Design an enzyme around this catalytic site. Structure first.
Site, PDB file in Angstrom:
ATOM      1  N   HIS A 132       0.971  -1.095  -0.004  1.00  0.00           N
ATOM      2  CA  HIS A 132       0.162  -0.414   0.186  1.00  0.00           C
ATOM      3  C   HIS A 132       0.898   1.436   0.098  1.00  0.00           C
ATOM      4  O   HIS A 132       0.384   2.139  -1.032  1.00  0.00           O
ATOM      5  CB  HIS A 132      -0.828   0.195   1.668  1.00  0.00           C
ATOM      6  CG  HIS A 132      -1.394   1.059   1.197  1.00  0.00           C
ATOM      7  ND1 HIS A 132      -3.078   1.035   1.251  1.00  0.00           N
ATOM      8  CD2 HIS A 132      -1.453   2.634   2.394  1.00  0.00           C
ATOM      9  CE1 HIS A 132      -3.290   2.525   1.553  1.00  0.00           C
ATOM     10  NE2 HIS A 132      -2.139   3.147   2.271  1.00  0.00           N
ATOM     11  N   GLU A 133       2.104   1.814   0.466  1.00  0.00           N
ATOM     12  CA  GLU A 133       2.427   2.221   1.333  1.00  0.00           C
ATOM     13  C   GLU A 133       3.537   3.045  -0.301  1.00  0.00           C
ATOM     14  O   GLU A 133       3.495   3.710  -1.009  1.00  0.00           O
ATOM     15  CB  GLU A 133       3.642   2.972   2.527  1.00  0.00           C
ATOM     16  CG  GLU A 133       3.156   2.797   3.597  1.00  0.00           C
ATOM     17  CD  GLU A 133       1.889   3.518   3.233  1.00  0.00           C
ATOM     18  OE1 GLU A 133       2.211   3.992   3.104  1.00  0.00           O
ATOM     19  OE2 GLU A 133       0.806   3.955   4.134  1.00  0.00           O
ATOM     20  N   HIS A 170       1.996   4.667  -2.680  1.00  0.00           N
ATOM     21  CA  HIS A 170       2.070   6.314  -2.374  1.00  0.00           C
ATOM     22  C   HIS A 170       3.809   6.712  -2.397  1.00  0.00           C
ATOM     23  O   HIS A 170       3.671   7.856  -3.579  1.00  0.00           O
ATOM     24  CB  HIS A 170       1.934   6.562  -1.052  1.00  0.00           C
ATOM     25  CG  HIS A 170       0.768   6.377  -0.462  1.00  0.00           C
ATOM     26  ND1 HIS A 170      -0.604   6.661  -1.207  1.00  0.00           N
ATOM     27  CD2 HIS A 170      -0.068   5.990   0.802  1.00  0.00           C
ATOM     28  CE1 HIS A 170      -1.569   6.404  -0.022  1.00  0.00           C
ATOM     29  NE2 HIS A 170      -0.718   6.174   0.628  1.00  0.00           N
ATOM     30  N   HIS A 229      -5.434   7.408  -2.713  1.00  0.00           N
ATOM     31  CA  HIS A 229      -6.303   6.773  -1.530  1.00  0.00           C
ATOM     32  C   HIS A 229      -7.272   6.572  -3.412  1.00  0.00           C
ATOM     33  O   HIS A 229      -8.195   7.054  -3.832  1.00  0.00           O
ATOM     34  CB  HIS A 229      -6.674   7.154  -0.279  1.00  0.00           C
ATOM     35  CG  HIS A 229      -6.102   6.482   0.178  1.00  0.00           C
ATOM     36  ND1 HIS A 229      -5.204   5.925   0.869  1.00  0.00           N
ATOM     37  CD2 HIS A 229      -6.228   7.631   1.709  1.00  0.00           C
ATOM     38  CE1 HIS A 229      -4.278   6.474   1.839  1.00  0.00           C
ATOM     39  NE2 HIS A 229      -4.878   6.811   2.465  1.00  0.00           N
TER      40      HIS A 229
HETATM   41  O1  LIG Z   1      -1.676   8.001   8.663  1.00  0.00           O
HETATM   42  P1  LIG Z   1      -1.352   8.276   7.547  1.00  0.00           P
HETATM   43  O2  LIG Z   1      -2.333   9.587   6.736  1.00  0.00           O
HETATM   44  O3  LIG Z   1      -0.306   8.910   6.476  1.00  0.00           O
HETATM   45  C1  LIG Z   1      -1.940   7.199   6.380  1.00  0.00           C
HETATM   46  N1  LIG Z   1      -1.202   5.370   7.006  1.00  0.00           N
HETATM   47  S1  LIG Z   1      -1.711   4.654   7.729  1.00  0.00           S
HETATM   48  O4  LIG Z   1      -0.767   3.988   8.668  1.00  0.00           O
HETATM   49  O5  LIG Z   1      -2.996   5.280   8.727  1.00  0.00           O
HETATM   50  C2  LIG Z   1      -2.163   3.110   6.920  1.00  0.00           C
HETATM   51  C3  LIG Z   1      -1.624   1.792   5.865  1.00  0.00           C
HETATM   52  C4  LIG Z   1      -1.937   1.051   5.308  1.00  0.00           C
HETATM   53  C5  LIG Z   1      -2.929   1.926   5.056  1.00  0.00           C
HETATM   54  C6  LIG Z   1      -3.392   0.001   4.682  1.00  0.00           C
HETATM   55  C7  LIG Z   1      -4.927  -0.340   3.280  1.00  0.00           C
HETATM   56  C8  LIG Z   1      -4.542  -0.733   2.685  1.00  0.00           C
HETATM   57  C9  LIG Z   1      -4.133  -2.276   2.778  1.00  0.00           C
HETATM   58  C10 LIG Z   1      -3.395  -2.268   3.513  1.00  0.00           C
HETATM   59  C11 LIG Z   1      -2.741  -1.164   3.891  1.00  0.00           C
HETATM   60  C12 LIG Z   1      -4.351   1.652   5.513  1.00  0.00           C
HETATM   61  C13 LIG Z   1      -3.957   3.075   6.806  1.00  0.00           C
HETATM   62  P2  LIG Z   1      -1.273   6.676   4.840  1.00  0.00           P
HETATM   63  O6  LIG Z   1       0.066   6.823   4.237  1.00  0.00           O
HETATM   64  O7  LIG Z   1      -2.136   5.529   4.256  1.00  0.00           O
HETATM   65  O8  LIG Z   1      -1.138   8.010   3.858  1.00  0.00           O
HETATM   66 ZN   LIG Z   2      -2.214   5.324   2.150  1.00  0.00          ZN
END
Ligand SMILES: O=P(O)(O)C(NS(=O)(=O)c1ccc(-c2ccccc2)cc1)P(=O)(O)O
Ligand SMILES: [Zn+2]
Ligand SMILES: [Ca+2]
Ligand SMILES: [Ca+2]
Ligand SMILES: [Zn+2]
Length: 163
Positions: free
Chosen positions: A118-119, A122, A128
């Site tokens: 996922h990361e 980005h 998203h």
């Molecule tokens: O708190 P951030 O806005 O930095 C989020 N980071 S997170 O830790 O809340 C996050 C990381 C991975 C996921 C993810 C989604 C789908 C599948 C696997 C992981 C979801 C949320 P983002 O990198 O997605 O913008």
């Molecule tokens: Zn994300």
């Protein structure tokens, strides 16, 4: 397209480096999770990821706790798992993982391969998705990893940027 401003890498063979590890997994298990996460995107695009062991790479991967130099602190167990910077020089592309998590290669929270995959979306210029089946959906969920491939929405996304 998709991250605002359409940031994208100018070349398609990118290097990566894993700067440190997590006590939760072996070094090999982390290397594998990261390698397989990159390969998900590589098989759907012209991107080719090449690992280096030391020195300057396009995409740095590291595990850090709380404040770690980039003004986006982690938050301890649970909550924020990881984050990554849009394509660009320096910190651009880099992916950080919260060192206070239980990191796994199983169905138990949190599967490193899935979070890294996922990361790296980005890191490559995707934002998203609203498709709840997409890897780039905003909330983590486990799905089977043994034979995993990108959901079709994420293929649509990486193809829109890089072909
Ligand atoms: O708190 P951030 O806005 O930095 C989020 N980071 S997170 O830790 O809340 C996050 C990381 C991975 C996921 C993810 C989604 C789908 C599948 C696997 C992981 C979801 C949320 P983002 O990198 O997605 O913008
Ligand atoms: Zn994300
Ligand atoms: Ca956290
Ligand atoms: Ca970088
Ligand atoms: Zn960070």
């Amino acid at each position: 397209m998709l991250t605002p401003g359409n940031p994208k890498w100018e070349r398609t063979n990118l290097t990566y480096r894993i700067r440190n590890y997590t006590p939760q997994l072996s070094e090999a298990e982390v290397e594998r999770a990261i390698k397989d996460a990159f390969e998900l995107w590589s098989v759907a695009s012209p991107l080719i990821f090449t690992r280096i062991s030391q020195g300057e790479a396009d995409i740095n991967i590291a595990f850090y706790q709380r404040d770690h130099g980039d003004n986006s602190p982690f938050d301890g167990p649970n909550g924020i798992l990881a984050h990554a910077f849009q394509p660009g020089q320096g910190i651009g592309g880099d992916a950080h993982f919260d060192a206070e998590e239980t990191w796994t290669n199983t169905s138990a929270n949190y599967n490193l391969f899935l979070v890294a995959a996922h990361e790296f979306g980005h890191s490559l210029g995707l934002a998203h998705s609203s498709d709840p089946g997409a890897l780039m959906y905003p909330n983590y969920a486990f799905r089977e990893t043994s034979n995993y491939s990108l959901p079709q929405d994420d293929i649509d996304g990486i193809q829109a940027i890089y072909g």
